[PDB]
Design a protein around this motif. Structure first.
Motif, PDB file in Angstrom:
ATOM      1  N   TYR A 229      -1.027   1.297  -5.302  1.00  0.00           N
ATOM      2  CA  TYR A 229      -0.414   0.028  -4.940  1.00  0.00           C
ATOM      3  C   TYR A 229       0.700  -0.286  -5.928  1.00  0.00           C
ATOM      4  O   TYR A 229       0.663   0.147  -7.082  1.00  0.00           O
ATOM      5  CB  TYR A 229      -1.436  -1.110  -4.925  1.00  0.00           C
TER       6      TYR A 229
ATOM      7  N   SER B 154       0.805  -1.214   0.000  1.00  0.00           N
ATOM      8  CA  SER B 154       0.000   0.000   0.000  1.00  0.00           C
ATOM      9  C   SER B 154       0.841   1.268   0.000  1.00  0.00           C
ATOM     10  O   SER B 154       0.289   2.353  -0.205  1.00  0.00           O
ATOM     11  CB  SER B 154      -0.936   0.005   1.207  1.00  0.00           C
ATOM     12  N   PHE B 155       2.148   1.161   0.222  1.00  0.00           N
ATOM     13  CA  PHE B 155       3.015   2.328   0.275  1.00  0.00           C
ATOM     14  C   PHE B 155       4.372   1.965  -0.307  1.00  0.00           C
ATOM     15  O   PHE B 155       4.730   0.791  -0.420  1.00  0.00           O
ATOM     16  CB  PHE B 155       3.161   2.857   1.705  1.00  0.00           C
TER      17      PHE B 155
ATOM     18  N   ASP C  12       6.534  -6.062   3.597  1.00  0.00           N
ATOM     19  CA  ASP C  12       5.404  -5.165   3.402  1.00  0.00           C
ATOM     20  C   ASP C  12       4.517  -5.572   2.235  1.00  0.00           C
ATOM     21  O   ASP C  12       3.405  -5.050   2.117  1.00  0.00           O
ATOM     22  CB  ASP C  12       5.905  -3.737   3.186  1.00  0.00           C
TER      23      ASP C  12
ATOM     24  N   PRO D 200      -5.172   2.937  10.484  1.00  0.00           N
ATOM     25  CA  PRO D 200      -3.881   3.160  11.144  1.00  0.00           C
ATOM     26  C   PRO D 200      -3.262   1.850  11.593  1.00  0.00           C
ATOM     27  O   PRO D 200      -3.966   0.839  11.733  1.00  0.00           O
ATOM     28  CB  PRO D 200      -4.244   4.041  12.349  1.00  0.00           C
TER      29      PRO D 200
ATOM     30  N   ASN E 228     -11.194   1.285  14.165  1.00  0.00           N
ATOM     31  CA  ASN E 228      -9.754   1.134  14.294  1.00  0.00           C
ATOM     32  C   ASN E 228      -9.391   0.628  15.683  1.00  0.00           C
ATOM     33  O   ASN E 228      -9.961   1.061  16.687  1.00  0.00           O
ATOM     34  CB  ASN E 228      -9.054   2.464  14.025  1.00  0.00           C
TER      35      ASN E 228
ATOM     36  N   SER F  77      -9.323   9.474   9.196  1.00  0.00           N
ATOM     37  CA  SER F  77     -10.018   9.453   7.914  1.00  0.00           C
ATOM     38  C   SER F  77     -11.077   8.362   7.972  1.00  0.00           C
ATOM     39  O   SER F  77     -10.749   7.172   7.990  1.00  0.00           O
ATOM     40  CB  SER F  77      -9.043   9.219   6.762  1.00  0.00           C
TER      41      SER F  77
ATOM     42  N   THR G  18       3.738  -0.655  10.512  1.00  0.00           N
ATOM     43  CA  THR G  18       3.151  -0.498   9.190  1.00  0.00           C
ATOM     44  C   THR G  18       1.632  -0.560   9.297  1.00  0.00           C
ATOM     45  O   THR G  18       1.089  -1.311  10.110  1.00  0.00           O
ATOM     46  CB  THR G  18       3.685  -1.580   8.243  1.00  0.00           C
ATOM     47  N   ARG G  19       0.950   0.251   8.492  1.00  0.00           N
ATOM     48  CA  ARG G  19      -0.495   0.337   8.598  1.00  0.00           C
ATOM     49  C   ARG G  19      -1.174  -0.743   7.763  1.00  0.00           C
ATOM     50  O   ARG G  19      -0.573  -1.362   6.884  1.00  0.00           O
ATOM     51  CB  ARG G  19      -0.991   1.714   8.163  1.00  0.00           C
ATOM     52  N   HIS G  20      -2.455  -0.964   8.062  1.00  0.00           N
ATOM     53  CA  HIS G  20      -3.236  -1.939   7.310  1.00  0.00           C
ATOM     54  C   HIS G  20      -3.509  -1.446   5.896  1.00  0.00           C
ATOM     55  O   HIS G  20      -3.330  -2.186   4.922  1.00  0.00           O
ATOM     56  CB  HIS G  20      -4.548  -2.229   8.038  1.00  0.00           C
ATOM     57  N   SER G  21      -3.942  -0.197   5.764  1.00  0.00           N
ATOM     58  CA  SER G  21      -4.262   0.382   4.468  1.00  0.00           C
ATOM     59  C   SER G  21      -3.953   1.872   4.523  1.00  0.00           C
ATOM     60  O   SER G  21      -3.279   2.352   5.440  1.00  0.00           O
ATOM     61  CB  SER G  21      -5.727   0.118   4.098  1.00  0.00           C
ATOM     62  N   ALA G  22      -4.450   2.610   3.532  1.00  0.00           N
ATOM     63  CA  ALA G  22      -4.244   4.052   3.515  1.00  0.00           C
ATOM     64  C   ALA G  22      -5.126   4.761   4.533  1.00  0.00           C
ATOM     65  O   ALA G  22      -4.818   5.887   4.939  1.00  0.00           O
ATOM     66  CB  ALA G  22      -4.503   4.603   2.115  1.00  0.00           C
ATOM     67  N   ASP G  23      -6.219   4.129   4.958  1.00  0.00           N
ATOM     68  CA  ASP G  23      -7.161   4.746   5.880  1.00  0.00           C
ATOM     69  C   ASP G  23      -7.306   3.994   7.195  1.00  0.00           C
ATOM     70  O   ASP G  23      -8.096   4.415   8.045  1.00  0.00           O
ATOM     71  CB  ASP G  23      -8.535   4.884   5.214  1.00  0.00           C
TER      72      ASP G  23
ATOM     73  N   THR H 271       2.305  -7.832   1.267  1.00  0.00           N
ATOM     74  CA  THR H 271       1.413  -8.882   1.736  1.00  0.00           C
ATOM     75  C   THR H 271      -0.008  -8.768   1.203  1.00  0.00           C
ATOM     76  O   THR H 271      -0.841  -9.618   1.535  1.00  0.00           O
ATOM     77  CB  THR H 271       1.368  -8.898   3.270  1.00  0.00           C
TER      78      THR H 271
ATOM     79  N   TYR I 293      -2.334  -6.808   6.894  1.00  0.00           N
ATOM     80  CA  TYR I 293      -1.389  -6.984   7.984  1.00  0.00           C
ATOM     81  C   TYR I 293      -0.856  -5.637   8.447  1.00  0.00           C
ATOM     82  O   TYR I 293      -0.687  -4.708   7.650  1.00  0.00           O
ATOM     83  CB  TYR I 293      -0.207  -7.860   7.566  1.00  0.00           C
TER      84      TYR I 293
END
Lengths: 422, 105, 422, 422, 105
Positions: A203, A155-156, A163, B82, C382, C403, B75-80, A165, B27
């Motif tokens: 992605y 994602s980044f 990362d 945390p 979250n 967000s 590391t975050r799960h997604s862009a939105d 995954t 993850y």
């Protein structure tokens, strides 16, 4: 008016040295000689129906649920695979008579060698297509199908493989031109598959990923001796080399034993030359045969050269009873090391089948199998990818005092087994 | 000190997470990098199972100061979504080696 | 003489921004317009049989197993849901002609809106009942059904919500009076559902739990323009408001991501005014239409106010091939923040169907969808319930740097699909 | 021509004290009186087909998939058990007319008491055999079947039971001689089963394990009062006493709730004298009855002594409607402790069935059940086999301040149920 | 002492359990409550995965005695099955802060 179809195999077996039945496949090979070498029971139940028919136009609906259990118990709970659910409309389009528009999860035109149970052109899965267009000299079929890998996307912007995954989808676009009569009694079919990795927004894949690939295939089918002979040549490039059957894996990232991503990059090529057939000799002899050479040359040096040669002759004592034999030889050489591991298997069975052909199914066979192998390399999967730099890599049999592969050995099993397709 | 010592990093537990939303599983990874004087001596990652890092660093007399850097990244799960990770505190002791009362072999 | 019935949908799709098909649903809404907006492959297979018949008396046995996969691969292991297994005996009671006694797990008289795939009266499950009692003016049906929640009951007296983790059972008792003739072509159906939490002996719920609830429904269906229009008004109190279709959840306790209990108390009411129908104009035009207002007012202020307006016209060039449009609008206002999430979606498809009606199924569509949304609030999921005080609560999209929701954006997808019921 | 067969049961229930329906079975007893006691939704579906038939020879293929769910919800994900997949060939051998050669996973010639749902001779599973051999006086059948235990085998010479965690395969060889006419209307059947643990190369069982065992069965069926009466005597030795239905468990170790091995060594024997039947008196009364004494005497002193006696009368008002009463009594005495725990249940139901017999199925029942029990011993299963040295052993119901067993109490349930076999 | 001190609570691992009997699933939760001078400073719960508590309590000079209370409670699976939980020993150290031997930034 439900149509009940499918496949099934199940039986019981013992190993001569002790325990339940063991099925032998040399490391580095993607297939094994199936007669007397089935470790588990596998069924595919299909419930279809022609739900609408007018004149020549029709709609057919087909499902397929697959079960695979280990034949060790009566109550064996598993996770059935909903492998197929699709609808095909035939003769709906008037501009292209005889063609079909289909959508859903489909077993799309699978080509395989039965004796080794090896599919070499299989792009089955969720998709949609326009099939059997009469183009004059031949029949043209277009299809789009989807595959997916459990990881490979981040994602980044990261340089850490751990990362990557996120599950990544892949698209296969397939165009086939079949039934081209080029020989008296022989036909030709060509096929082109383009596979790509469909990334989402924001992605990315790991650096150096194949990200796409190609698969070109040619197959000549010749009708001789009341049977057939298929000679196929396939060339795959990049992401189409990991599987080799027509689906794409452009991420090049796998999950190890502890669910940590690691690099299995598949940049390179694969060349496969295959010749398999079934022949009737006399009124009492039938014979299946296969011979194939497959070379996977990867940029990380983890490819393999694989030679397979096998025959399966059956003699008919009676329109229902027959005696089958199967002799097969496999030889795989690694690219990382250069060592060769090989095996040969001889199976003798007495079978009762519902017909007079080697393809006649509802078959019950009592068999004795004997396999002798020697192995000079194996794959390193001990520990996990974090602490093992050789995880998933081909290493010699005694690398640094390890024990990789099956070694030099010999074994024999026996038992009974039923196999059917209906 | 006139004699060599042992820097013991007590068990540090770090752990990530896994989260399934709309059938998609993501993850959050916890990375712990431990450097001795700028040299990487530990590189650990965690996704679901906890990971414990405890170590002994032999510091000799006269060589100089010992600097231990613990860097933890999540590391975050997604862009939105945390990151959702856990990491215990870093506690470091210094002991004598070949003391009087206790002796370990 | 096995009766093979069921439903299925499956296909393939892409998004313009990249990746596999994404299907759009406004935050806070309980449904999404379904044309070209289905994210998965679904299939219910039902193998029924009439096992006994004498005169008018009959016995019918019904099964139903459901598979829901992500249509991302060929082999998709899944946990199928055993949805129905029941027996219904018809004309078995001499006193009440035409009434049937049924027992088992049943899809009991579900009312739904097809465009949004939204069930507004669905008390299906395990149960038993006496159905279709002729009372003169209408038909009276009585049923008892069971639902359950994964937690909510504590074995000992406690104040810690984490102790309320034992699964709780709920009973619904349903009385329906249907098929009232009020006006020429109009039919009325009234229904009363009482739901309660069935606590095990020496078990209890959290303080302030609803523990029981009501659902009153009144539906008028009118036959107009070769189709129908249904106007339904529903009013639910307490435990019948959390789900909103006719099953009770009186414990008001839910498990978080890490399997910890937290309070989702559903004290309050819900009002649902719906009007949906299918119309046929000319010999070439068909239409589905939908208008919904659902206000869930809760004591903890976590309710919603949902407006839905939808249209789906269909133009038939040929008795097989047609073009189908669909325009939908959702607007959900949160009770505790006062913000609004709105979205509108336009999809255009070309479809081949087995018939000349908007309900003729074996249907294969090629579609393009465009959805534009603007969301000013979302749900905070979250972390877990222990560390997050807003877990499960509606919060503004810009809450303390977080967000929440899908933001303000738009997206276009395309692909092919098949839908069938048989 | 697909044949659809199988079995199913499903319903709704309440407990008098509160909650869903509770299910009453005495501790130590291996069965419970099922009328008004069935606790879950169960269904085996069999999709068979005769795929080949010529003259007298035939091939029949049979499947069986089973689902068991808690009947607490509508959507209930489950792991179905692939219970059967097999092919049977009839009249394929001219030497032995009337015989059948079968292979696959099969429900091989099970014997059961329906009243208490007890299979006292069941070697079903994966296997192969030759059955129905005409030998003159009787019919001889030979079969080989596989069973398995999740642990009980070690890869190396070890003395720690925690090392014995590898799957152990067991073989059962069964020889049956059925249908001896020894008296007017009476038929005798004798069976011998030998079971043994099959160990892989360089794998060992724990010290003192039972390894292999025997089962001898004698059964007499008498045709009396338009029904049947079966008197059976069974003697099992060693590994065949742990289950006692004809399958072997020769490892003696089992996993606890935290996946740690512990010893359940089953050296010893098991005597079972059973008499069960179904008769019809008058044209209005039907009757089922069962009486059984089963003594499992082990060497670790953890066996049981079980007396069961039950009746089930049925009065037919109408060829459709009937009233069924069932009274059952169970008494289990522990070998370890010497305590006797007992229970009696009385259930009254009104049922509508498809026929005039007690064996007529598609049945819908409305029932009320009462059961009173007094329990003086129980099984210690709390904690681990490590921390708890009494794990799995029978202990008095007041051992060191603990509470083991169900105590001394009574309870009544009620509800509705459907049961069917087709 | 005339200087401020740090009371470090070393990693304390507590864990509950889950047991499934006859398809019915029950939890045994482990609750750990830590009070500083009667004020709740930690309130943690464990069901299946281990939870690790390790903390720094800043005690200054002259503020008074510091009392740390560790209460641990275990809930049973049901009325018949006793609780099955685990909790490691409570270990507390007192260190100097801003010392000249070991520094931490």
């Amino acid at each position: 008016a439900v149509d009940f179809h499918g496949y099934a195999r199940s039986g019981i077996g013992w190993t001569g040295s002790g325990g339940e039945q063991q099925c032998f496949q040399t490391t580095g090979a993607q297939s094994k000689y199936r007669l007397g070498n089935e470790c588990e029971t596998y069924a595919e139940l299909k419930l279809g129906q022609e739900v609408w028919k007018e004149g020549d136009k029709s709609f057919y609906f087909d499902t397929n649920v697959a079960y695979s259990v280990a034949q060790q118990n009566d109550w064996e709970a598993t996770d059935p695979a909903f492998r197929e659910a699709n609808v095909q409309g035939k003769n709906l389009i008037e501009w292209l008579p005889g063609s079909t528009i289909w959508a859903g999860k489909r077993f799309y035109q699978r080509h395989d060698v039965h004796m080794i149970d090896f599919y070499y052109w299989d792009i089955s899965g969720p998709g949609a297509g326009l099939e059997n267009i009469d183009v004059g000299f031949g029949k043209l079929s277009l299809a789009a199908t989807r595959s997916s890998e459990a990881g490979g996307s981040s994602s980044f912007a990261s340089n850490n493989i751990y990362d990557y995954t996120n599950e990544t989808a892949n698209d296969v676009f397939d165009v086939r031109l079949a039934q081209m009569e080029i020989n008296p009694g022989g036909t030709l079919e060509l096929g082109v598959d383009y596979g790509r990795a469909n990334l989402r927004d924001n992605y990315r894949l790991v650096d150096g990923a194949s990200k796409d690939g190609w698969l070109f295939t040619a197959e000549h089918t010749q009708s001789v001796l009341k049977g057939f002979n298929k000679f196929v040549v396939q060339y795959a490039t990049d992401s189409m080399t990991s599987q080799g059957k027509g689906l794409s894996q452009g991420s090049g990232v796998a999950f190890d034993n502890e669910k940590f991503a690691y690099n299995i990059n598949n940049n390179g090529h694969m060349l496969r030359i295959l010749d398999h057939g079934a022949i009737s000799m006399g009124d009492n002899w039938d014979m299946m045969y296969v011979g194939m050479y497959q070379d996977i040359n990867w940029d990380n040096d983890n490819g393999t050269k694989w030679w397979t040669v096998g025959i399966r002759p059956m003699y008919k004592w009676t329109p229902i009873m027959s005696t089958v034999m199967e002799i097969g030889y496999d030889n795989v050489e690694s690219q990382r090391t250069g060592d060769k591991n090989n095996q040969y298997k001889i199976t003798l069975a007495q079978q009762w089948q519902a017909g007079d052909s080697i393809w006649s199914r509802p078959a019950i066979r009592v068999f004795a199998t004997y396999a002798k192998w020697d192995e000079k390399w194996g794959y390193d999967y001990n520990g996990d990818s974090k602490v093992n730099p050789n995880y998933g890599k081909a290493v010699p049999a005694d690398f640094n005092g390890g024990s990789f592969g099956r070694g030099d050995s010999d074994e024999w099993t026996f038992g009974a087994q039923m196999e059917i397709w209906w | 000190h006139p004699f060599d010592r042992q820097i013991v990093v007590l068990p540090l537990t770090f752990r990530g997470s896994k989260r399934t939303v709309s059938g998609r599983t993501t993850y959050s990874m916890c990375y712990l990098k431990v450097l001795m004087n700028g040299a990487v001596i530990y590189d650990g990652a965690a996704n679901e199972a906890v990971q414990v890092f405890s170590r002994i660093v032999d510091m000799p007399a006269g060589r100089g100061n010992v600097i231990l850097t613990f860097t933890l990244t999540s590391t975050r799960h997604s862009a939105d979504i945390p990151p959702y990770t856990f990491a215990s505190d870093v506690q470091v002791m210094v002991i004598k080696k070949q003391a009087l009362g206790i002796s370990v072999v």
